Amino acid sequence: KIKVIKVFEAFAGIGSQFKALKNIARSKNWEIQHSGMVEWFVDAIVSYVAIHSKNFNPKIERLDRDILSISNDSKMPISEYGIKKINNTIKASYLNYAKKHFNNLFDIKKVNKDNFPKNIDIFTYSFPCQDLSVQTRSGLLWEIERILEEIKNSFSKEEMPKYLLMENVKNLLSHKNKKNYNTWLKQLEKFGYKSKTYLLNSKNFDNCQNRERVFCLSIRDDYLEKTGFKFKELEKVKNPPKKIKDILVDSSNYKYLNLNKYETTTFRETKSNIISRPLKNYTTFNSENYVYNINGIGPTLTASGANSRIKIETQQGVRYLTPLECFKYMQFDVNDFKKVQSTNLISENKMIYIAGNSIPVKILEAIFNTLEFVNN
DNA sequence: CCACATGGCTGAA
DNA sequence: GTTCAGCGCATGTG
Ligand SMILES: C[S@@+](CC[C@H](N)C(=O)[O-])C[C@H]1O[C@@H](n2cnc3c(N)ncnc32)[C@H](O)[C@@H]1O
């Protein structure tokens, strides 16, 4: 009676999707399987392997000769020299393992109907808002569209992914983006999928973080008929609140910021349950100028900049949320963080970068909890 | 017009 | 090429 769930994660990062599925699997009588993934960012790949691998033993290796389109910064492709620098290192073994054991295809431009797995149960993806425009879609979405088009023609309808899940930032629903987002939804309809859009805040899913994200859950229309699946009203869900203090880690050796030069005010709580106070003459960048109270929720963790440097007031002084606490803030576990840290390949700022790019795990648990599969 | 709220990019080193 | 300290406005609601 156990159901094998084959998952394919496009733009996988550190695998919040895989983590969420593994977290709920027992309660659904599911066994989760990697069908494949697409992730080109070296430090995400390393971290994904660290978190999700079982009995992987890193060692110095030659980089597989076809691992050619990868990136050290997540934005730009690595040079021939950079590839040379990875070749014959422990790091190479992580990338080789992702290829061989997780079927990482690395670059979405290299995914086609000849290497895209058949019979995927859950396909996850995303795209930047620009991709809705010409420069008709572009970039990463054009590639997703191309792949769906290709497999539609070569696969039987039953071999196409049963569910699709997009995650995206809130501005996907802005005035300038929403109509063109709707045309993507039309396109998914043309591919044989019925979809529902959810705007969800992490704070309503057992987290101490204000983080509003857009999700488009799609189900293949014949599978909808077969299962009798109905979309759940997730935007009404409100779980009990959680405070920043609930995730903080005790230490005697934190670094505290010297804020003695800056004038401040009382804390104020906004409608969103964020409790903060400004620092005067600190910077000219508004989002850098706040200190957060640990008895409320915090701001959206970003990969870089002001919202990656989240100042909290504690009895011991004002400090940043640490990389460990940032993993906890995204609802990864302490053990997940320890595994990444133990690679000795990912800097503290890079850890925060990958955490900031991820998705709070319990939002995904809630979405995936609604999925229905036939006993076949 | 106002008050308020909220979340990556890049050039010097 | 990397790294991150320094830096502002876009996109809203009311
Ligand atoms: C915001 S993240 C997604 C993070 C992920 N949802 C997680 O659970 O951590 C977007 C990811 O897409 C990756 N990416 C960008 N361009 C890519 C490409 N051409 N091929 C594969 N991955 C790409 C980036 O490296 C980044 O990790």
Side-chain angles (χ1 to χ4, degrees):
Chain A
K1 209 184 181 192
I2 192 170
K3 308 207 190 83
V4 175
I5 307 302
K6 294 175 254 60
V7 55
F8 189 102
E9 295 168 277
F11 317 121
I14 56 169
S16 58
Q17 306 81 201
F18 200 79
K19 187 76 190 181
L21 289 161
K22 292 284 284 184
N23 284 351
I24 69 168
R26 266 271 278 157
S27 76
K28 307 292 280 183
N29 196 19
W30 294 349
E31 163 187 329
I32 317 306
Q33 218 169 70
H34 298 275
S35 161
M37 63 188 287
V38 189
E39 179 53 69
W40 82 330
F41 181 26
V42 168
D43 291 337
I45 297 159
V46 167
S47 302
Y48 186 105
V49 168
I51 293 166
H52 299 293
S53 68
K54 191 189 181 194
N55 312 310
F56 169 57
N57 294 107
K59 52 189 173 70
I60 294 163
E61 290 181 357
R62 287 177 300 275
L63 187 63
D64 277 15
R65 291 187 313 282
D66 66 2
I67 296 171
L68 293 171
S69 189
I70 48 173
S71 169
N72 279 328
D73 63 8
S74 84
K75 315 283 191 178
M76 296 297 286
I78 194 167
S79 50
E80 188 192 297
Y81 167 83
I83 282 165
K84 277 174 56 172
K85 186 175 169 200
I86 295 168
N87 189 47
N88 302 138
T89 65
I90 288 171
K91 184 179 276 204
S93 68
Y94 286 83
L95 303 184
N96 293 339
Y97 191 90
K99 177 183 164 183
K100 193 195 178 162
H101 291 267
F102 297 138
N103 190 33
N104 191 10
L105 304 172
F106 294 92
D107 185 353
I108 196 75
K109 301 180 170 42
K110 303 310 175 201
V111 180
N112 55 52
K113 59 90 177 179
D114 311 296
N115 61 21
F116 191 79
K118 292 170 186 196
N119 300 304
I120 291 157
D121 298 303
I122 305 173
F123 173 76
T124 65
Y125 72 104
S126 186
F127 57 87
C129 297
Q130 69 171 345
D131 290 9
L132 300 171
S133 77
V134 69
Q135 254 158 6
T136 193
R137 284 147 286 261
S138 70
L140 277 48
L141 189 50
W142 186 92
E143 301 291 335
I144 297 296
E145 188 181 3
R146 179 186 52 79
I147 290 154
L148 294 174
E149 286 176 350
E150 283 183 27
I151 64 168
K152 178 79 167 178
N153 287 339
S154 294
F155 286 14
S156 67
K157 177 133 195 168
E158 293 85 4
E159 287 165 341
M160 295 186 71
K162 301 176 182 59
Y163 290 92
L164 324 174
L165 181 64
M166 180 209 74
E167 176 264 358
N168 228 302
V169 300
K170 180 168 151 205
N171 197 66
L172 185 56
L173 304 181
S174 75
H175 295 333
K176 311 206 174 202
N177 293 328
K178 178 146 197 159
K179 178 260 177 161
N180 294 337
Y181 168 66
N182 292 324
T183 67
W184 172 238
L185 299 182
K186 299 300 185 180
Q187 199 54 46
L188 285 177
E189 267 198 281
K190 291 177 176 170
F191 290 136
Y193 291 86
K194 299 298 189 197
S195 300
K196 184 164 180 69
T197 302
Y198 299 105
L199 176 65
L200 299 178
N201 196 326
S202 191
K203 79 184 192 188
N204 295 321
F205 296 89
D206 192 43
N207 210 1
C208 56
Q209 178 185 175
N210 179 68
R211 194 193 192 86
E212 296 187 79
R213 292 293 180 267
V214 178
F215 297 89
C216 184
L217 180 61
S218 304
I219 181 171
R220 201 182 70 215
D221 53 21
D222 68 301
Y223 208 66
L224 178 59
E225 291 178 35
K226 195 169 189 182
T227 56
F229 166 91
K230 293 181 174 177
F231 287 99
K232 300 293 175 204
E233 290 294 338
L234 293 173
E235 295 185 359
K236 304 184 305 210
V237 173
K238 291 191 199 307
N239 291 292
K242 181 144 157 279
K243 304 178 172 206
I244 292 167
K245 55 167 32 167
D246 301 329
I247 65 161
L248 296 184
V249 175
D250 290 345
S251 179
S252 289
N253 294 284
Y254 287 142
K255 308 172 178 67
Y256 297 94
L257 301 173
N258 188 327
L259 304 179
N260 296 328
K261 180 184 173 191
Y262 313 104
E263 301 90 344
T264 194
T265 69
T266 60
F267 281 108
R268 160 187 310 202
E269 183 173 355
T270 65
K271 48 202 172 181
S272 67
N273 194 196
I274 297 173
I275 306 175
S276 70
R277 60 185 174 78
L279 304 172
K280 184 193 189 168
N281 306 308
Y282 184 66
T283 76
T284 63
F285 204 76
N286 198 250
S287 57
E288 194 91 40
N289 295 338
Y290 288 86
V291 176
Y292 295 95
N293 189 294
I294 68 179
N295 294 297
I297 66 172
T300 286
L301 178 72
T302 58
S304 63
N307 278 34
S308 79
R309 290 184 287 261
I310 296 174
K311 293 178 290 306
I312 56 164
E313 184 178 300
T314 75
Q315 301 267 316
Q316 290 162 306
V318 175
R319 58 174 184 87
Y320 296 124
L321 286 185
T322 63
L324 170 51
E325 291 166 336
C326 289
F327 268 54
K328 294 180 77 185
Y329 202 58
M330 301 302 288
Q331 296 171 321
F332 283 82
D333 304 322
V334 181
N335 291 342
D336 301 324
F337 174 79
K338 300 272 181 192
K339 282 163 182 167
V340 174
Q341 184 181 54
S342 289
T343 67
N344 298 306
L345 288 169
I346 321 292
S347 73
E348 288 194 291
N349 287 340
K350 277 275 191 81
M351 284 165 177
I352 292 170
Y353 192 95
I354 64 184
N357 271 340
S358 200
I359 306 173
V361 173
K362 294 187 158 288
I363 295 173
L364 298 175
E365 293 178 20
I367 294 166
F368 292 144
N369 268 334
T370 76
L371 303 195
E372 302 266 346
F373 294 97
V374 306
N375 315 68
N376 202 46

